[PDB]
Amino acid sequence: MTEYKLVVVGAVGVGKSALTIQLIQNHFVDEYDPTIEDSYRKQVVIDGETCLLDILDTAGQEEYSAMRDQYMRTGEGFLCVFAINNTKSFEDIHHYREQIKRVKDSEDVPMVLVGNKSDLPSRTVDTKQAQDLARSYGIPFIETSAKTRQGVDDAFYTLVREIRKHKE
Ligand SMILES: CN(C)C(=O)c1cc2cccc(F)c2o1
């Protein structure tokens, strides 16, 4: 039962903890609440491998400046959660990558690209754009709706896979 450090990254309004609450107790909150530091643990069987998920929710606001390259190193897998509602959240992911790369001390890294708010008719960015960008970094793109839990399960298992494939 291995514990993988899973940390989510994104902006305010995307719903990073939405995926976690949907997995822990399986509940979706309507009233968006800005989270600062929350830890979620649950025993899940990954492809037959019973593991313990040690997920940590990070702040979506750029408050921490000279304090990010501290706990960001302990993070194993990062969840690039963006929203198709606003392209701003899409470009925000880029900054996180640049930061993560310096913290990982390597060019390559096992990560996944997930597009939230896929169930909303407010599509500012298209699938091809996300797929195109994902192909450059060699990361898989999965559509994820936190409103009805669409693609969340798939994305979760795919992420853990990338981590295990990276080592084994
Ligand atoms: C109960 N949890 C989540 C921890 O003690 C932990 C710490 C931590 C730091 C960076 C990234 C992570 F995923 C992390 O998990």
Side-chain angles (χ1 to χ4, degrees):
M1 189 181 61
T2 342
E3 294 152 88
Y4 315 80
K5 302 295 167 175
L6 252 62
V7 33
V8 286
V9 287
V12 187
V14 190
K16 305 176 277 76
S17 349
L19 309 175
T20 359
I21 309 305
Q22 188 96 88
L23 258 296
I24 306 302
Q25 56 270 90
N26 202 339
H27 180 72
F28 181 61
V29 69
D30 189 271
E31 195 157 329
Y32 201 98
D33 195 56
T35 29
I36 310 94
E37 192 175 279
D38 255 277
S39 314
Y40 311 87
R41 278 166 69 94
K42 183 164 186 179
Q43 298 151 30
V44 184
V45 191
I46 318 295
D47 202 47
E49 190 71 274
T50 327
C51 307
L52 214 160
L53 279 70
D54 196 72
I55 302 183
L56 174 71
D57 189 26
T58 353
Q61 21 208 84
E62 305 180 86
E63 325 180 295
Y64 284 125
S65 312
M67 202 62 181
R68 202 183 297 276
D69 285 46
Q70 192 247 36
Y71 56 95
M72 210 173 195
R73 172 63 209 173
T74 338
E76 292 183 86
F78 293 83
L79 238 178
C80 310
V81 191
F82 77 90
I84 64 169
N85 202 149
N86 197 323
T87 180
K88 192 181 164 69
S89 65
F90 189 68
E91 295 185 290
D92 272 352
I93 299 297
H94 211 181
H95 174 249
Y96 283 105
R97 184 268 173 177
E98 305 293 78
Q99 205 72 25
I100 292 166
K101 197 196 78 170
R102 287 176 172 85
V103 179
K104 282 294 191 198
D105 250 294
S106 305
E107 293 281 296
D108 185 69
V109 60
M111 289 197 294
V112 301
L113 191 69
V114 289
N116 212 278
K117 310 305 193 209
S118 355
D119 56 289
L120 293 189
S122 318
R123 181 209 278 157
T124 298
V125 278
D126 50 86
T127 335
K128 197 243 282 168
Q129 287 290 28
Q131 291 170 328
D132 169 74
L133 193 71
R135 270 167 177 262
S136 324
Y137 304 107
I139 51 169
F141 168 72
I142 308 105
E143 246 179 57
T144 11
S145 172
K147 177 59 185 171
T148 199
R149 187 201 38 97
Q150 197 72 328
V152 185
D153 299 79
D154 196 49
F156 255 77
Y157 295 126
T158 305
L159 173 58
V160 192
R161 261 163 43 211
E162 295 289 270
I163 306 177
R164 281 163 76 78
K165 292 156 56 184
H166 213 256
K167 307 305 198 69
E168 274 67 48

